[PDB]
């Protein structure tokens, strides 16, 4: 019966990640759609034939200054349409959004700023958040379903971070950041794909770049597949494997009881 697999990875530079084996690992995962974030590549850079995956169409969107963003989406089916951007600057100037439309459902790749390099960067992250809330408050009135493969740089609940008491003071688990996700998953009615099938802790998707973070698992769950409520009962499995990886982020692999078509 019906099945679809969607894999989402923040690659922290698609060339750096590819040099680490990302593409041959993806080729083998049996994904219907792959969503990448933070490619750091220009449209011309992504024209390099070694980024193509056999059996997949590849779409991308680049940041004005390519290193500041970029996202991409591979699909086995040729989507009905692909659109980029969200209609606000902290997305559109940074290639932080791209969407593929299928029958009844669109699947997107979404990237936020991390807000980790000072107050200016955190201002930019809060503004993106607020503008994205506004977009979702309108979009939830549409009839089609959406799967937002999102690299959010925000962990929602205590179980989504290791040592929540120290994290509370750092970008990623600030009170207004947790509040934003409470709004997304609460009043706005969206679903957290992994949380529809698992309430266990110790499932993280990002680690600072240090051997001590790696040995002690000082991880944060920053990567999600955020769902329209019509898809919430279709989730089958979700996994954030610690290995292999290609960046500071783990891949998020989610299977759904849904037969993708165009
Ligand atoms: Cl906010």
Author numbering: 1 to 262
The study reports:
Crc controls the sequential assimilation of amino acids and inhibits the expression of several genes involved in uptake and catabolism of sugars, alkanes and benzoate. Thus Crc protein seems to operate at the crossroad of metabolism and virulence in P. aeruginosa. Crc shares sequence similarity (25 to 37% identity) with DNA repair enzymes belonging to the family of apurinic/apyrimidinic (AP) endonucleases of both Prokaryotes and Eukaryotes. However, Crc does not appear to have nuclease activity.
Here, we report the crystal structure of the P. aeruginosa Crc refined to 1.8 Å. The crystals of Crc diffracted to 1.8 Å resolution and belonged to space group P3221 (unit-cell parameters a = b = 74.66, c = 123.16 Å), with the asymmetric unit containing one molecule. Crc is a compact, globular αβ-protein, consisting of two six-stranded β-pleated sheets flanked by six α-helices forming a four-layered αβ-sandwich motif. The overall structure of Crc shares high similarity with members of the AP endonuclease protein family. Four conserved catalytically active residues (Asp210, Asn212, Asp283 and His309 for hApe1), located in the cleft on the edge of the αβ-sandwich, are a determinant for AP endonuclease activity. Among them only two (Asp220 and His246) are present in Crc. The bulky side-chain of Tyr150 (corresponds to Asn212 in hApe1) protrudes into the active site, occupying the position of the scissile phosphate group of the DNA backbone in the apurinic/apyrimidinic site. The substitution of this residue to a serine in Crc makes DNA hydrolysis rather unlikely, which is consistent with the previously reported lack of exo- and endonuclease activity of Crc. With the exception of Arg37 (corresponding to Lys98 in hApe1) these positively charged residues are not present in Crc. Most likely, this results in a reduced capacity of Crc to attract negatively charged nucleic acids.
